[PDB]
Design a protein around this ligand. Structure first.
Ligand SMILES: [Mg+2]
Lengths: 257, 342, 114, 71, 237, 231, 155
């Protein structure tokens, strides 16, 4: 059985929500209700099978290449992504429930701000945030996820997913919406991806991708509607990126010590 | 906040690589190119009061830590990683360490897993004998006996019934026998006796080794040499013995050859697969060594002092019963070491 | 009681089957329940049966008849290939239709004495 | 395609599609690879269209296909 | 094999060694075994009830308990030959455990042969943790399968909502069909929705089968050719 | 306080307690470091595997009890730990593996890099049957002298001349070197092939990358055959 | 089943795959062969006439562009790029053909919204099925019957 992880300072979260982003009701929808909804569905889908003993991140990797396990993949991807989002927007990862700590001033580290300049042609963090807000509004028509990811070449770049698209495995990033029209450049990207997946010799037709997320923003209606409303998702993404927990985001960047 | 501290080192580390790289560049250049021109400069130069300071400070600094020194004497993890340049992509080793970082923090985000059986935990987290239930025994498959066609009718009193062509062992009796056997292991462990764990079926070694480790006992997983107990001087006399205190620490006292040839008999023998270890069981009888064994429906109960009715064919059932006995021994060992402290 | 627990055990859930494990006639549907073991349990020859399956078996799927026999072996075949036939049918996305236009057997229809 | 000659007494050949044996109906003619390959016709993969799938009382599935040929 | 005596009497044989002086030092196990005596009866025990179905073992129905005529129309006035044979053996033979659920399980998989193709894991997690409310078929912790139907049928007959087992079984079967149809659609739609957002898959199930068949059909081609050449030469004889 | 005598090794009652204890120690390391990746230079076939001999391991692994299959099992685990990526290895693994390396490392090697002399000449000696040859190879234009005499004068058989040219033909450098060959003993065939062997050994100094091609052609192998007194 | 935004449509296939004088007779062209259910995701349309072939058309541009760059490089085609592109194109076409022709259109008759925007406010995270149950009990079948084309009684 997959159970909803306990979050630090949960009593505060159930009373005052997440300050500057979500209210108490908004946080109950995104985490206490939706995470319960996902875990229960995952348990029903995977109970009695070998996947029941694997954590959601491993399930999505195991099932990423199986077309008829997409339902399990979607549930595992959403569960992993949601706790990635709830973790970097959380007031404090440490449990100051008995310490009553009210001073958590976390700021981008030097390694993060050094990789931002290197990967964005000298753009500042503030400018990159504006690009992230723009990318979310123009690339995610409906539900999806906004990620700041790091690849095998030490370069930070922006990835957006539609519905439950994993950042780890490019064949399942779901960054192109094929319901609408696509340019010849987008079709070239899809065609090149298909060729890479066909070069793999494995009988499971799987490729190697070492991309890892650094920041996760939930763009689903379960996270913003109640507090922001239809059409105000760009005000929600702005608040999330301005009140990130950088103790968690800094730890996600590999330092090498 | 303190990143600069590491940055200060990395700066020196980079500088050191630069100095070494161009030290090797000058190792290729012929001496005829550098030496004569270098000497000529000195022939055209005059030492100054300051220059002379280093003329003798370096002579001693090099006659103290290079010539008149002792060449020998009578970030710790992964200290041999060769980091890649900040412009170059991650190396294979760095990607492995980058994945290990992800595995500790992120890889387990999203959900926790409850009420799922993990095979390794039977060996490393065995329950205490008092917390064992019929359900737990049944989950491990201890109730599944042999085919009714292979029944050894001397086990009749342990049988709960037959189902799907096999005899079902009565777990209520298994639990009572298991508790009695566990108390014996704890008693012998708390008394300082030698406990030997014998099992020669494939896959049992891991359980046998850990059981011996946590009870400070002994195990045999490969083959019981016929005569190990009755012919001990011809088989085990050559191997080394040691003296230990009440805390099981080696005293270090050298042993007289008289003390190193004497038979060292186990105080208790635990047998996972008695049907294939008749030799050991008979030697235990001859040597008056109490024995514990898992007795399946085709196994003779009277050949052992303390039988435990149960499936002996499944590694889960065997490791579950072995784990319980091993933890009972551990508690006896911990109670003996505690009474010595106080 | 132990008897109540046994009736609900996972081994009890598998219906008794003595059909030949090696059948050379016409096969129209699965005849044996596929048993699956997880990778961790396979590493320890644990399948939830009475005895350990021989380590030679590398598949994670088998079909069996008897937990134990007079020959002191399990009667099993290390194959689970009827599941791939069902999943390949699902991938073809062709619904099964009645050539006689009968009522759908999976719906509780109000039938009459026609 | 399993056989290089239609099922005897039947106007349809047999194909092996997805772990099931189906009855393949050809548009008009049989592709020339049949005569060429002969009894090794099963060594090659063709594209088929699944017309309908029925269930018989014996518990079998009656799958009808159509040998889509490049045109 | 004879009931052994020397394995359970190690304490008594050892005590004779110590009392006589043949053994100077008491063994470490000696005190432990003395406090925890071995069981040494090794007897066959009678049993008077089948634990599975509660059937009484060892009860003889006397002619006084059969006053009415039988199915043949005859009264029973004397014990029959079976009643006059001693039946002590039945007290000692391990009872055959039976369950009504076994009959339904065989029926379910006879009616739905392809349910067998859904892999089942026999390795238990913890039987003691199962907290199931069989008012509904779905349960957190276990898959939806044939056993879900059987347990639902038992709950219906246990709560007396239905009287006949067949009626309860049919009611449970339809609940099972509804849940199976909702899952068949969730998987089809999930695949369709993913492809519409740019999901790419290396090998499908159909493709996997084709590749495996090619590997076998290639070895078969070689052998056929080889054995169609030995025949030609051997037949030439 | 009370003291007792107990078996030293947990494997005391096994057939070979000493071997099983050592295997257990190595198995613990392979379990603790199961994740560490292995060398990708293993494909490059790194030439390093100096493990102690079966007889040397018998001093520490049970003596007579030691079985060949037990020694094979020790090597499969020593190599697996040794083949862990050097960057990602730790001290614990190396400490355990140190005890199993041949102690020949105590001393040093007896090979000094060969180099051209003051006049750019590579000097090598070759032997065939009872004949010996000392050749001087220098960069030139294909001039050859045998004992101060022209090649066609000293060696009358064209097959002997072709044998001398073969090593230069393998490296396609027949017109790139001048050879001054001096030979003594045996007959024409022994001397010609002794010169052949010596030229091949002298050509490796000019380009050590061509040694593998010379070895594959068979010109760097000393022919052992000699006249055998009938027995 | 729809996870995010989308619509479940009750459609009616148009039996006018001829394409000759198409959309010229509001009755002869408004004829439905069979009804179907179709799912659209995000801003997808249920018509299928204005968006079919899109991938095939873009696929043929990509191959031609790659084939023209190959000619500049000077390559001798390939062993299986002409047989793989051909198969990819042959399947793309055979999967979009109609019973007679390749003009398959659909007439929207009903549409149920799956977007969480519709049902999250009143029914909550766990009440999508409750929403869909009340939606079925809230459909005015008069409006749907009105949209229904006239049956194509070619039979
Ligand atoms: Mg047994």
């Amino acid at each position: 059985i997959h159970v909803v992880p306990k979050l630090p300072n949960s009593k505060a979260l159930l009373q005052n929500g997440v300050p500057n982003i979500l209210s108490s009701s908004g946080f109950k929808t995104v985490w206490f209700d939706y995470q319960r909804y996902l875990c229960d569905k995952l348990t029903l889908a995977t109970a009695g099978q070998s996947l029941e003993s694997y954590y959601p991140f491993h399930i999505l990797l195991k099932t990423a290449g199986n077309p008829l396990q997409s339902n399990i993949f979607n549930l595992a991807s959403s569960i992993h992504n949601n706790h990635l989002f709830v973790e970097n927007i959380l007031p404090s990862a440490v449990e100051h429930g008995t310490n009553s700590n009210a001073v958590v001033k976390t700021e981008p580290s030097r390694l993060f701000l050094s990789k931002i300049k290197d990967s964005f042609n000298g753009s500042d963090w503030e400018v990159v945030k504006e690009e992230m807000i723009y990318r979310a509004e123009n690339e995610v028509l409906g539900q999806g996820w906004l990620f700041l990811v790091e690849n095998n070449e030490k370069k930070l770049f922006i990835l957006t997913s539609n519905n439950n698209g994993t950042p780890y495995y490019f064949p399942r990033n779901q960054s192109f919406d094929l319901n609408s029209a696509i340019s010849i450049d987008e079709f070239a990207t899809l065609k090149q991806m298909k060729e890479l997946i066909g070069k793999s010799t494995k009988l499971n037709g799987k490729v190697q991708d070492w991309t890892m997320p650094i920041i996760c923003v939930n763009l689903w209606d379960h996270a913003y509607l109640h507090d922001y409303g239809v059409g105000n998702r760009s005000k929600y993404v702005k608040n999330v990126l301005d009140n990130l927990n950088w103790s968690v985001v800094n730890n996600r960047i590999f330092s090498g010590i | 906040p303190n990143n600069n501290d590491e940055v200060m080192l990395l700066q020196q580390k980079l500088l050191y690589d630069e100095i070494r790289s161009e030290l090797k560049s000058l190792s290729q250049v012929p001496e005829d190119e550098i030496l004569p021109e270098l000497k000529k400069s000195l022939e055209q130069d005059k030492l100054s009061d300051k220059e002379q300071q280093l003329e003798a400070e370096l002579s001693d600094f090099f006659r103290n830590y290079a010539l008149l020194n002792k060449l020998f004497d009578s970030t710790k993890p992964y200290p041999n990683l060769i980091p890649s340049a900040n412009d170059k992509p991650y190396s294979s080793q760095e990607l492995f360490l980058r994945q290990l970082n992800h595995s500790m923090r992120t890889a387990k985000l999203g959900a926790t897993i409850s009420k799922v059986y993990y095979p390794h935990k039977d060996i490393f987290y065995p329950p205490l004998p008092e917390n064992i239930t019929v359900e737990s025994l049944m989950s491990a498959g201890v109730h599944l006996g042999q085919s009714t066609s292979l029944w050894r009718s001397s086990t009749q009193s342990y049988i709960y019934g037959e189902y799907k062509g096999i005899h079902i062992i009565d777990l209520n009796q298994t639990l009572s026998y298991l508790k009695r056997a566990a108390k014996v292991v704890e008693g012998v462990s708390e008394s300082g006796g030698i406990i030997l764990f014998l099992g020669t079926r494939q896959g049992q070694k891991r359980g046998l080794e850990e059981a011996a480790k946590k009870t400070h006992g002994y195990y045999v997983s490969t083959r019981w040499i016929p005569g190990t107990l009755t012919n001990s001087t011809e088989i085990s006399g050559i191997w080394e013995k040691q003296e230990i205190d009440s805390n099981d620490n080696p005293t270090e006292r050298a042993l007289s050859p008289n003390e190193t040839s004497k038979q060292v008999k186990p105080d208790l023998l635990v047998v996972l697969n008695p049907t294939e270890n008749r030799n050991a069981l008979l030697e235990a009888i001859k040597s008056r060594v109490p024995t514990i064994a898992i007795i399946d429906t085709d196994s003779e109960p009277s050949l052992v002092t303390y039988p435990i009715p149960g499936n002996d064919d499944s590694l889960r059932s065997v490791n579950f019963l072995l784990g319980v006995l091993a933890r009972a021994g551990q508690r006896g060992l911990q109670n003996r070491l505690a009474r010595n402290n106080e | 009681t132990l008897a109540e627990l046994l009736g609900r055990s996972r081994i009890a859930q598998v219906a008794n089957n003595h059909k030949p494990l090696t059948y050379t006639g016409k096969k129209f549907h699965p005849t044996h329940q596929i048993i699956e073991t997880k990778p961790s349990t396979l590493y320890r020859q644990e399948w939830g049966l009475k005895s350990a399956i021989p380590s030679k078996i590398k598949s994670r799927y088998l079909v069996y008849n008897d937990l134990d026999t007079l020959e002191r072996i399990t009667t099993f075949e290390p194959r689970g290939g009827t599941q791939w036939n069902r999943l390949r049918f699902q991938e073809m996305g062709v619904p099964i239709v009645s050539n006689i236009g009968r009522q759908n057997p999976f719906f509780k229809y109000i039938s009459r004495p026609e | 395609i399993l056989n290089v000659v239609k099922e005897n007494n039947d106007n349809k050949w047999l194909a092996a599609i997805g772990g099931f044996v189906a009855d393949v109906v050809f548009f008009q003619s049989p592709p020339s690879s049949f005569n060429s390959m002969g009894d090794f016709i099963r060594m090659k993969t063709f594209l088929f269209e699944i017309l309908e799938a029925s269930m018989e009382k014996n518990g079998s599935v009656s799958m009808h296909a159509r040998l889509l040929e490049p045109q | 094999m004879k009931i052994q005596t020397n394995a359970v009497n190690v304490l008594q044989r050892t005590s004779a060694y110590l009392k006589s002086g043949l053994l100077k030092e008491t063994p470490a196990w000696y005190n432990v075994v003395a406090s925890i005596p071995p069981s040494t009866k090794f007897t066959r025990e009678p049993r008077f009830k089948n634990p599975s179905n509660g059937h009484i073992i060892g009860k003889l129905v006397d002619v006084t308990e059969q006053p009415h005529a039988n199915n043949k129309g005859l009264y029973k006035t004397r014990p029959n030959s079976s009643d006059k044979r001693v039946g002590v053996k039945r007290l000692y033979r391990p009872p055959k455990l039976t369950y009504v659920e076994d009959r339904l399980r065989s029926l379910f998989y006879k009616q739905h042969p392809w349910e067998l193709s859904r892999p089942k894991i026999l390795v238990e997690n913890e039987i003691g943790d199962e907290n199931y409310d069989w008012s509904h078929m779905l349960q957190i912790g276990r898959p939806l399968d044939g056993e879900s139907v059987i347990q639902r049928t038992m709950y219906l007959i246990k709560t007396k909502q239905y009287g006949d087992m067949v009626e309860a079984y049919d009611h449970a079967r339809y609940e099972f069909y509804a849940l199976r149809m909702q899952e068949e659609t969730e998987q089809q739609v999930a695949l369709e929705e993913a492809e519409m957002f740019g999901s790419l898959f290396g090998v499908s199930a159909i493709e996997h089968g084709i590749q495996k068949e090619q590997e076998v059909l290639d070895v078969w081609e070689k052998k056929v050719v080889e054995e169609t050449e030995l025949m030609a030469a051997r037949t030439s004889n | 306080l009370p003291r007792r005598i107990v078996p030293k090794l947990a494997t005391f009652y096994s057939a070979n307690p000493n071997h099983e204890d050592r295997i257990n120690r190595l198995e613990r390391l392979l379990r603790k470091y199961i994740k560490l990746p292995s060398q990708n230079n293993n494909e490059a076939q790194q030439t390093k595997a100096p493990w102690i001999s079966f007889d040397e391991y018998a001093l520490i692994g049970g003596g007579t009890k030691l079985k060949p299959t037990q020694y094979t099992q020790l090597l499969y685990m020593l190599n697996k730990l040794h083949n862990i990526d050097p960057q990602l290895t730790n001290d614990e693994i190396t400490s355990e593996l140190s005890q199993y390396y041949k102690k020949s490392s105590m001393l040093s090697n007896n090979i000094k890099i060969k180099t051209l002399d003051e006049f750019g000449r590579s000097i090598a000696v070759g032997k065939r049957k009872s004949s010996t040859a000392k050749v001087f190879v220098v960069r030139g234009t294909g001039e050859i002298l045998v004992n101060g005499r022209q090649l066609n004068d000293y060696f009358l058989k064209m097959k002997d001349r072709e044998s001398i040219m073969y090593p230069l033909q393998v490296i396609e450098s027949v017109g790139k070197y001048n050879i001054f060959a001096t030979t003594s003993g045996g007959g024409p065939t022994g001397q010609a092939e002794s010169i052949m062997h010596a030229i091949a050994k002298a050509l490796v100094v000019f380009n050590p990358l061509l040694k593998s091609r010379l070895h594959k052609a068979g010109v760097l192998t000393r022919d052992y055959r000699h006249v055998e007194r009938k027995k | 089943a729809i996870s995010g935004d989308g619509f479940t449509w009750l459609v009616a296939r148009r039996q006018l795959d001829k394409r000759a004088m198409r959309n010229d007779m509001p009755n002869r062209d408004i004829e439905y062969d069979k009804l179907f259910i179709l799912n659209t995701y995000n801003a997808g349309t249920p018509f299928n006439f204005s968006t079919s072939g899109v991938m095939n058309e873009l696929n043929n541009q990509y191959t031609n562009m790659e084939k023209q760059r190959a000619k500049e490089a000077g390559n001798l085609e390939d062993s299986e790029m002409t047989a793989k592109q051909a198969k990819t194109k042959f399947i793309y076409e055979t999967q979009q053909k109609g019973f007679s022709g390749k003009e398959v259109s659909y007439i929207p008759l009903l549409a149920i919204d799956a977007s969480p925007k519709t049902w999250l406010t009143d029914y909550g995270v766990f009440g999508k099925r409750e929403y869909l149950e009340r939606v079925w009990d809230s459909i005015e079948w008069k409006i749907v019957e009105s949209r229904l084309p006239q049956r194509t009684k070619i039979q």
